[PDB]
Structure formats: structure tokens, C-alpha cells
Amino acid sequence: SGAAKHHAVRVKPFSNATTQPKIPDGLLTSSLSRRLQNVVGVRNGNSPSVHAGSDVMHVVIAPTLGVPVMIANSAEGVLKRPGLSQESSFIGFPGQTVGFENLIESTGVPTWPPTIPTGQKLENKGGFVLWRIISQGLRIDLANSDEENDGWFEACRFNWRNVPRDVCMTPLDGSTTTNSIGIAPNPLWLEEVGYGMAMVEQPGYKSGLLKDIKKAEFMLHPRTTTHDPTLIDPFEYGGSMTSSGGIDNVYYPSDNVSGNAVRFRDMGVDQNMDWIYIRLHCRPNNGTSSLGSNFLFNVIQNVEVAFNPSSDFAAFQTINKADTKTKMVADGLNNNPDVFNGR
Amino acid sequence: GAAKHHAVRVKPFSNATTQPKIPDGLLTSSLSRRLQNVVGVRNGNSPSVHAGSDVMHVVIAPTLGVPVMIANSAEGVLKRPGLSQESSFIGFPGQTVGFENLIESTGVPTWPPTIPTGQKLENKGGFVLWRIISQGLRIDLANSDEENDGWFEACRFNWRNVPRDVCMTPLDGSTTTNSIGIAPNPLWLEEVGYGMAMVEQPGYKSGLLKDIKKAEFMLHPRTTTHDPTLIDPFEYGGSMTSSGGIDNVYYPSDNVSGNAVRFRDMGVDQNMDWIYIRLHCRPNNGTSSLGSNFLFNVIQNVEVAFNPSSDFAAFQTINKADTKTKMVADGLNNNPDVFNGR
Amino acid sequence: GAAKHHAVRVKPFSNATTQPKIPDGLLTSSLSRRLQNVVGVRNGNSPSVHAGSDVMHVVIAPTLGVPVMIANSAEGVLKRPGLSQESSFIGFPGQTVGFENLIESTGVPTWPPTIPTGQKLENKGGFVLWRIISQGLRIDLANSDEENDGWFEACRFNWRNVPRDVCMTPLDGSTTTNSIGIAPNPLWLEEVGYGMAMVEQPGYKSGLLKDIKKAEFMLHPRTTTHDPTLIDPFEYGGSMTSSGGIDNVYYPSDNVSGNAVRFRDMGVDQNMDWIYIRLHCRPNNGTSSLGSNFLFNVIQNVEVAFNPSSDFAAFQTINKADTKTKMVADGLNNNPDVFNGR
Amino acid sequence: GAAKHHAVRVKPFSNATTQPKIPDGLLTSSLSRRLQNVVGVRNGNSPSVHAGSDVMHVVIAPTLGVPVMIANSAEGVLKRPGLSQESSFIGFPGQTVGFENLIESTGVPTWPPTIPTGQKLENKGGFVLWRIISQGLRIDLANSDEENDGWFEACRFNWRNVPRDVCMTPLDGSTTTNSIGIAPNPLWLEEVGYGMAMVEQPGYKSGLLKDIKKAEFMLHPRTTTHDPTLIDPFEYGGSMTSSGGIDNVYYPSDNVSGNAVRFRDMGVDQNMDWIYIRLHCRPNNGTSSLGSNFLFNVIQNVEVAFNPSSDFAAFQTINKADTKTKMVADGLNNNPDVFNGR
Amino acid sequence: GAAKHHAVRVKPFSNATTQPKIPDGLLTSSLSRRLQNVVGVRNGNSPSVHAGSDVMHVVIAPTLGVPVMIANSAEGVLKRPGLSQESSFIGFPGQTVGFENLIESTGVPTWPPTIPTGQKLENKGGFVLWRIISQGLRIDLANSDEENDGWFEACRFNWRNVPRDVCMTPLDGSTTTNSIGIAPNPLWLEEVGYGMAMVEQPGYKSGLLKDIKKAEFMLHPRTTTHDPTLIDPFEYGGSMTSSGGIDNVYYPSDNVSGNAVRFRDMGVDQNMDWIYIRLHCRPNNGTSSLGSNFLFNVIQNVEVAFNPSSDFAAFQTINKADTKTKMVADGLNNNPDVFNGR
């Protein structure tokens, strides 16, 4: 049937079954989908202070809108965020429908970084307010030569604590300056949960060699029950959002109890999905004799949205027909807690 | 009888039962009311706001109490001159649903609200959880064969969910009664509706006004579970505003306050889509052409869970889940056509 | 496999499994705890508030940690004299659930809260998502056969959903311990309970106190997806309040603040209904006649999704969806009878 | 079905129909409600007013909303100490009937009334014409075999129709709610009831309290046409008064003002007789004897004509005249016996 | 799977799918858009060109973006007085297709073109290959029933294929907007249309204007492979021309230049035929009688192959060949009737 391609994309995020996947449950009567993808080379960094004497690169793949991947202790992170935000780098989906634009609220002039405490406005540029994740996957390949392919990795999926300050907003293209913004997992989660986490005790935890990580594939799991959409609400902020104050330009709620913090958390995250945390114990990188482990990151976030009539995409929307196999497809998918499976 | 419930679900004006429900077993004890109103509507002769324009703009939204807003209406021109797009509203007065505005400190009922003084929007329905079983609109042109020209175009759409797109106004369509309901805000036309490319929306249709009596407009639900809407307590000051004139149409001052989002959530069944209609009517200039006369028949079938303090709580019955509910919903919403035959 | 889960769903006190679930596959990885408590309750001898009254008022609510509130109990009269309707609370101390009040600036645990100074209600469970698999109360008249007179009446109702109808108090029923849960507020009796004509409510039943040992009260879930509740971070200054006395029962200071709605949403499983019970007991004069003594047995089967930091995360198991879940829920909630044969 | 209407006419607690009427065709379009309430009652331990007296005085009158007044009640002693004969009231809260007191100039709801400031007693029922199809009271002694002593005596009588014999008080039996109904005034006991020669009234009966569970008290209608009662607009100042204390029982200041007569006429169905009961209970001294415990079950079957502004007007049905109505009424009222078997 | 595609192929206005295709597997990766427009058209009141004439001439051509040209329309008389036969154009503004005129040396967009200075017609779609899945026109007489007189006649014909029979004008029907499409040139009426004896053409039909609402005009494709059109880069100086007036309708200055043939080939899907319609309307004197007002509804379903630079490239889907494509096309084109029952 026609739902076969949708189910295939549901269980295999990188599947080539269809360019316009859907969750065939009939929730979004008329909707369109985009397969957001990005491929980036990532290398563990040589940090002077924050990750001094550490060859561990920390990866969080989260169901956030636009910037699902956060990497701490990457060379790009050390370059772009020196000593700030855990020297992290972000992989997002620039030049694709989703995203926001920061404006000065009083005048409407786009502005990045935000000039807080002055009033700001995150303008939703996607032409949609309801969105959900069909499936989200990450593929990591060790791109070093055979004489430098040493190291290992550990990974586990987990139930996120839903703390507003665990998510942040950063440019979709991974820079610190472009005013096309997405929602990313905050590096603050690493130093409050991630670094101290007892990974081995999490169900589904797995480990392996970096030279074999190219055979692994990490994907988030949805619920077996109906996958409710996330509603993007209007968002304006003054001092209710904050950053480290440095050139990293990673902004997150100033606290966890304000109404803005909860609104930001709810609108920026698909809370039907789980999170995955990966530690890459890489080849050392000191810049003189060891130059770290270079990786190939391939992240795909399949998203279904309901476009509003003002959008030019509203003409392309198609009908979402409910299928009888959707629930059992999802249950079969999420009945295995293994953090990764073979490609 | 699940068959009668399904019949009402797919045909809002069906007479299968007087107590329809969504037979999914979500609300354990509940009671439903089929809110209805019949109103005559004519495109207005506005001096400035719609000067020279023969288009009457109709929005049918899944709001509690006042589903229909009509801009460039003769009633709108008379009641709300030069304000709120000279709109008129069709609601459900004298039926259980509704609110009453009070001055919060003293408790004195007060309409229009005395902003910035603290106000309270008291829920008078005796319920806090509500949902829409089905909503329908029927329009008939009431002109003679010598005056029955014109055409219409309509489409359903996914609403952008902006708090200022909804407003609160008297249920009976007046500006003073103080039996308030939630309506689509005429400000939606100024920002989305007027400049909207209707022809590009899926399910868009057009037709002649003389043939609109054979059409029927209904909102479409989701195929999945139809979650109910919760009415929260509502007190406000400067967080709500209006045009400041005698139109007495009030709405959130901005789109970002907590009150704005609470108002949006509680006033709208966000499981249902919206429909927009443009009526290209006979000109109404006041001297040589006197417009198109319409009969509007709007029905909103609502299911609520009454609280024990209500004088309707004793009449609640059980909601029994039926197997065919999802199939009925999917069959209903699989066709995006804005209207069908009656 | 899922038969034990269904058994616990329909029978809260069933011995089928120590780790029940709602087998719908909603929480992929989750663990469950069967929160239970057995207490002895007798009607009190109030000097002023319930002076001369022989009625104990019991509310069974789907609140996290302290589901039962008893007004005009001996323990209520002793611990909370002339305050909060001299009510007692039955909670689940020493088990996983609960909060801890802190001074926000320093993090030092502190009970009672030092209003209006900034307080933080730290969630001490390792979970943020929780839902009630099933909740039930058993009441046993422990009086001698010679003193078995009296009668009771009960009803289930759709809850007002007002923030001030819920409160926070120590889990162990005291006023001093800094392990806090969420309880139905005795203010609900003042506003709704006392003035309710219970006999009119659907599913209302009455019986003799000597036959209450054969009855079982249990809340009714929905037939649709039992969506979980999210515990949000909570910090309060003047947004919470109390009677000002030593009863230390704290609740939102109004029904409209952001904290009020957050508290109400996070503390209550809104997929369940509430139960109100009136116990008409033997009089308690304090010296010679000690009224009626009961055995209260309340069980709240809760499913939670533990976060990584929790030591319980290692024990979580996979929730597999079962085909009979909807049928079981609908069969359970299709009967509005407030109690069924034990 | 005239048979079901007649069955309800002669047996107030009959379950023949949920929509009884007097099938005489007087009210063309009407809707009926079976108002009911169940209350536990105990004879009180009064310090001064009923000191040393074990007699609890019960009046059941055809008043709208609060048919039963009970003097020397434990609830009366607690709620209305030393005032209004320490009476308690059984009404019908949360059911359609009732009034709301407002301050006339500002319209602010206000209970207790702020006399001498101008007040308004707003009719909240949505109707102005009402009548009683049948009214019944059932009393059961709830004491054990070791404490079930005592006796009772009762009689029906023609009421003297004195305005101060009726009063207005909250429907739910409290002193503060501000959902008002009409009750027999405890002042009737001080002027007629207490000194009344009950044994001389036709139909007088007596019995043991332990056997009162087998009795049933109902008011008798006329055999001729049962004319409806009209609720007039009511605004008052010094024309109404109370004891001045916290009992909040209000009644006409004199018996001759226009307001007094209007209050009397609108609050009472003057086609029905009154019944007076004396319960000679177990002593309630507070230490060695703790009184008799009763279950009061009162039902008032009312037929009204709803006005078009009411949210009940849509549900009204036709009253069809039946041939046997007069025979049924005459057979009912031909026996003056105060009570019969259940 | 392909049933929806076939439905759109035979019924241009069908609601089967928002992304139709010709399922022949010609374009491996492609996306489709259903270009639609609904406009009101009435016959004009010309001073000179069509002075006293009641005939509107309509050409439905397979031109990219502006398929319909109407001569002697009110809009044509207003926008293009005494020029280009006072014609109107119905195009598809704001949708993906279209061009932008530039000054070739600087790249600055410029409309109207600054002949004879070098101009560039930049293709603003992200595609170079395009073909028409199906094209249809619906005409609805919007006049009142009293003024429904008149008749129409139409025929389909094999097109001359002369470059000057096509032109470029703004997509939105104006003369100023710099979003350009390809339209049938009104010069074709002067050379062919006006002098055509339509009644002799095969498939010719005539009817009454009051019955045109029941007719549907659609172009006929071939039964063989529907080869796509290629949009070539286009730069022009004197090779293009206009009337020299403010109508801004531009077309090749001769039929033999390389640019003339390139323009003709790239702007027209030559697998389709053309349709010519004559509408004989009520007279329009400009003051009292306004002629006949129609509702024009034209849909052009186009399949394109987007190039990598386009943002639409990500949305392209696989075109799978279907066995019924040839049969569907042959069944469609085997009937030469110019219109069929709607």
C-alpha cells in the first residue's frame, strides 16, 4: 500500500522510500513534510582549559527543531566558542523551511546576536506552527586512516528531564553570527546531567570501537501512542533569556520557572521522542603529534508540518490518511531499547 | 446508539439524535448540547472602511459560543460603524454556554469591560471541559430572480494559532448584553484573510450565490483522539484591549502574554480547522442597489463535562467507546472540499 | 503477559504484579510503584468548627502523593485545630514520589515555607512524567458489632479544575515533615462539597456503615490514551499562601497566576475523576463515646519515566502495547456507580 | 402517559417518570424538575434556647426551594447559635430553582443582605410560574438497637398565611452561600407551633421513632384546579428584617406591607397544606446521651413554565389534559392522615 | 496509486491530488503545481474598438503562466484602452512559474522593457523542463436570473504555430508588475479568430449563456508521449516589439527571427490544442446596463523538473510509469467536442 513508504521512513530515518514522508495516523488533516538533513565533518578538539587533558567528545542528539545535534569538545567548537558553552558545535538544517529570525521587537529590524535586555522577538519563518518528528537518525563514520582509527565509544538513550535550560537557540548553520535560528540541546545539560551520568546503567546502553561506529545507526524512538504535534507559540523576550555573555552567542532561558522558559521548552522540543547521549573516546588531539579522530556526521530529522494559508507551501499540502499498521510499526520500533542498530 | 452519534459527526444538521457524543469514551460522564442560531445577513453599505467594495467576508471558526464573524455586513455597519471591519457576529445566546464579565474587586457584572481596572471573565456554563462534535454553516440567498446575482469562494485552512485572531463579544450579536462568547477576531482578515490566496488552498471551491443554498460548510476534525478543551480561570487588566470605540470587541493586547495564550487555548477547539468564505454580492450603495440578503443557519454540536455544582450535572450520561469512530473521522476529513451538497 | 496489568487496572488492590503498567506503549522505558497506605481514622470531637457534628467528609482525588483528605477526623482535630476544616491527610511517605521545599537562594530545605521569601519545591523523584494506572480506597468500620450504626453516601464527579482546590502538605500526614505531596484542598468542601446535593449526582450510592467493609471506591480513567502529567520546576513567593496557622496546608493564593495553573496541572492527573464521600458516624463527645473508628486503605498505582540521574533508571522495563487496553478501560468506566462490591 | 403523572402525583418518591406534570393542560409549554436532597439530622444540645428539651420540631411547607425547617437541630445549634430557634434548613442547591441577592443600586451580589440599603432578590430560575406536583418527606432513625428510643407526633393543617411565617435562606442549608430559597420561618413555632394542640387536628397520628422508617409524609393538594404561583420582581429595604445576628434568616419586617404580601404569595404554593412534626428524641446532653440520628429524604416535584431567555426553554413539552386528574387528587386528599406506609 | 493522476488528467478541476503527474516515467524526478485562478469578467463598453459590440472573444491556449486572453472585456477596456483589442489576461501570479524582465547589461529588473536596449527575460522558476498535465476553463454566468440571456459558441483547433500569436504580459493581469508569463496574443484574433467561421470547425458547439455554468472546456493532449518543453535563455533587443502604448503586451517583431521561434517554442506546450470561444453577451452601455458578468475559473496542471539551485528540488518525487496512461489520454482526446458536461 501507499503507507508502506511512510512506515519505512518511520523505522529507517535515512530510508529512500519517499521524499515526502508522513505519520499516517490522520492527525494532521492536510500537511506537508520535509526531510531535513546535514552532513558535516567533525573532529575532537584540542582545548586549553575546558577539556584540557580530555579525548572525549560528547554528542547529544535531541528532538529539537532545527539543530538536533550538539557536540562538545570538537575542533569546530574550540575554534568558534573558545572556553565558552563547553566549546561545543552544532549541526543544524540551514536553508530549509524551518527556523526563526531574531528581531528587535519595537522596530522589527532583524538582529543577531540579540541586544538584550532590550525587547526581542523570535519570528517564526517556517509558515507553520504545528510540527512533529516522523523519525530522527544520526550516522557517525570514522574518517581517519587505518593507522589512526583507534578509540571507542559508548551510547545510551534516556528520558529527558524536561528542564527548560537544557535547550537553547543557536544559528541553524552552526555559526555564531547568522540570523537564521534553530533550537538545540544546551551544553549546560552536559555539566548538570551528561558528564556525571552513569551511562552503563541506562537500559539499552551499548559500546564499541570507533573503527566500527560506521556500522552503527542511532535513531530516536517515538511513543506507541498517538504522536501529538508541537505548537509553535509567539515568543518575545527581554531578560527572560540569557547567554554566557561571550562571543559564543548561545542563548537559553535565564531560569526554569518563568512562563517564557516553559513556553520555549514546549515549543522548541518534540516531547514525544527520547534523547540519545554518545561519548566518543577519540584519538588524542594535542596539535603536535596526535591530531584527533575525524568523523563524518550525517543527521536526518524527518518532520511533518501543517502549513498556514499565508505560506506559499500551503498549495503543496497533501491529505494525511490514517493507516492500520501505524501503531504496531511504532511499537515494534520502540520495543528494543538498544541505543544503536546495524545500518 | 453509535450510528446516530456518527451520523451527527459527519452531518452537523442531522436529526439522528438530540444528545450526540464522540463515542470514544474520553469523557466518562458528559452531556451535549446542539447550539443553533438562524440570522438574516446582508452585505453592508459602508462609508469608509469597505467603501465601494461588494465583498462580504465570513469566517467560521471552532470558537466557543460565537463561531461566525461576518465583515462588511449591514448589521456590522449599523452596530460597529468604522470599527472592527464593521463586522457582525452570530452566537448562541440563551443556551448553556457563555461567560459573564465582572469587575474583579467588587464582583459587579460589567459590559463593556472597564480596562485597566481588574476584570474577571466568569464561566457561567457550569463546565470546564468542552469539545465540538461537529460544526456546520448553511447559507441561502434570499433575493428575487431579478436580484440574485453574485458568486462566492471558500476554503478551509490550518489556523496559525495567533491569540489576537480570537476575541470576546456578546453571544447574541449585540455590543452590550454581557453574555459573552468567543469569536474569530476581525483582525485576522487584516493580517491573513484579505491578502490570502484562496485559490491555492487545497479544497478551494467557488460558485454562484444563487446556488449557495445547495452547499453546506462544516469544519473537519482530526482522525485521532479529539481531546477536550479546558476553560481556565481568567482575570485581566491591560492584558486585553479593544478598538476603544463602541464596537466593544475585546482581544489580547499582544500575542505573548500568559493571558493571551490562556485566552487562545480556552476559547478555541484546536482539533478543528477553520473555513473562510468570500461572498461577492450584489452592490449595496444605498440608492440604486441594495445588496444580497442571506439566511445564515449555524449549528455547533458541543459535548461538555458538567461540574457537580451545575443544574445540568444530574442529566449527564455515559460515553461508550465505539469501534468505528476513527473510520468515521478519517472518512469525513479525507476530502478537503470546503463545501458539499446538503 | 498483560493480563496482570489489566487486573491491576480494574482492581487497584489486586496482587497480580508488584510492577503494573498501562500497556499502551506510551512510556517506552518506565517503572511503576504501587503506593499504598493503611491508616485508622475516626470522626473527631471538634470544639468549634464541627462542634456537635458526626459527619466525616472524605475526598479521593488523583493528586500525586496525598490522594485522600478527611475533614472532621480526630487526627485532623488534633493536628490542625480550627484550621483547614480540621482535616487529615493520607499520603505515601517514604516511597519514591514527593517534593522537598527549599529556600530558593540557599537551597537549604525548609518546612514550613518562609513566605514571602523565595521558595523552591524541588522534585525529589527521579521522574518528571507520571500517570495513575488505577486508584482505589477501601474503608472498614473497625467498631465493635454493638456500635456498628451509621450510614454513608458517595458520588463521583467531574472536577471543577480550580487551582485552589489542591494543596501541598507533608506526605506522612503530619504538618512538619519536609516530604511534600499534593492533596485535595479542604477549601473545596467549603466551596463545593458541603453545599452539594449528592443524591442528584449520577452514580450516587448510599449504604450502611456496617456494610462499607463490602464496598470499594476507585477512580475511573478514560477509555482513550492516558496521557501522562509533566512535573514542571516550581518556585514561589507570594503566589502560594496558607491559613497562616500551624496546619501548614499551602495552596495557590489565587486561581489566575501562572504558578496557580502550573501547580494545578503538575499535581493532578486530569484523566481521572474525583470521589466525594460523606460518612455519618456515631457521635464523639471526647470522653465516653469515641464515635466510629475506620480502617482506611488507599492504593495509588503510578507509572513514571525515570530520568538518567535516578538510581531507578537501571530497573526500568519496556512498556509493550496491548490490544485489550481500550476494552479494559471502557469496561471499567462504563459504570458510574461510586463503589462496587469488594 | 397520564398514568405515570398520576403515580407521581400520589407518590412523591415514585419512579414512574422523570418528567412528571399535573395533566390538566393549564401550562401549555412547561418543564418539570424533581428536586431532592438527603440530609443527616440530629437533635441538638442547646445551651439556652432549647435547654433541657429533647423535642426536635420539623415543619414541611410548600415553599419554593427550602421546604423543610428543623428547630432544635444539632446543625441548627452549630450554625445558628441562640438564634432563629437554632434551626437548620433542607433545600435544593445546584438545582434550577433559586434566587440571588444583589445590591440594587450597583448590582453586586451580596449575602447576607445589607439592610437598609436597597436590595434586589433576583430570580435565577429562568421561570416565573411554578407549582408543586407533589411533595414528600421520609425520615429514618439511624440509631442502634441500644439507642433507638423515642416517639413522634405529626399533623397536617391549614396555614394561616401570615407573611412572617416564611423566610428566605440559602438553599444548601448554610448561612452564606447566596443561592437563596424560601423556607418556613422558625417564628411560626413561637406563635403557632409550640403552643399547638396537635392531638386535636384531624389526621393526627403518633408513633415510635424506631418505626418512623415505615412512614411517609406528603402534602395534599386541592381537588380543583392547581393554579400556578407567579414570582414577581422583588426589591426591598427596611421592609425585610432578620434577628440581626449571624443566622442570616431574613423575613418581612411586618405582615402588612406590600412587600410582605408579595413575598408570601410568590414564595408559597398556596394550593398545598402544611405538615408539622414533633420528634421526642433521645436526650442530647453532650456527655451521657448524644441524641437521635436521622436520615431526612425530602423530594419536591415542581412544574414550571420557562421563559424564552432560559437555557431550559428549548426542552419544554406539552401538558396534555387527562380525564382522571380530579379523581386522583380527590382520592389523595380525602384521607387527612398525616403519614402513610411507604 | 496512479488513479489520482489519471483523474486529474481527465478532470483538470478534480480534487484527487494536489501534486498530479503524467505517470509515464518521462521526468524521473519532478514536482507538480496546480496553477489556478478565479476572476470575474464582464463584457466591456469600448468607445472605439468594440463600440456597440456585445461579443467577448476568449482564447484558451497552452501558454506558460497566462493561458487565457479575453478581448472586449471591461478590464481590457480599462487597462488597455484602444490597444491590443482591449483585452484582458488571466494568469497565475504568485505561484512558482514566471519570468522577470531585466536590463541585460546591469541585471536591474525593469518593466516595461526598454526597447531597443538589450533586455534579458530571466526564468524565475527553478525548472527548465515543463509540460501541461491538463488544462481546463469553467465559465459561470453570474448575472441575475432576470438578465441571463445570450449565447456562446466554441471550437478547438490545430494552432497556426506562428510566433506572433503569443505574447508576454504580467502574470497578475496588470500592465506594470514585473512577473511575466506567456499568453495567446490578441493579434491572433485579428488574423484568424475574427474571420473564422466557427460553425464549420469539427467539434464546434453552441449553447445559451444561462447553460454555460453546466459546461467545461479543456484542452486535449496527445495519446503518445507528452514530451516536455524546454525554456531556453532569452535575450532580446529589437527582436521583440509592442503596440508602443501603455498596454505593455510584447511579442516577436517578426515571425522569422531566431528569437521569434525560440520564444514560440519555449512559451507553448505544442502537444496541446487551442480553444476559441465567442460569448454573445448583454450590451454594456456603461451607465445603466452593465452587460453580462461571468465567473472565469482556469486551472493549468503543470509538471516540471526542478534544477538543483531550487529550494523545491528537495520536494521532488519519483514519476513512475503507469500502464493506463495511453488509454486515458486516448479516451480523453477521442471526442472533439469543445466542451463537456461539468
Automatic annotation (TrEMBL), chains B, C, D, E:
<protein>
    <submittedName>
        <fullName>Hypothetical protein protein</fullName>
    </submittedName>
</protein>
<dbReference type="InterPro" id="IPR057959">
    <property type="entry name" value="Shotoku_capsid"/>
</dbReference>
<dbReference type="Pfam" id="PF25628">
    <property type="entry name" value="Shotoku_capsid"/>
</dbReference>
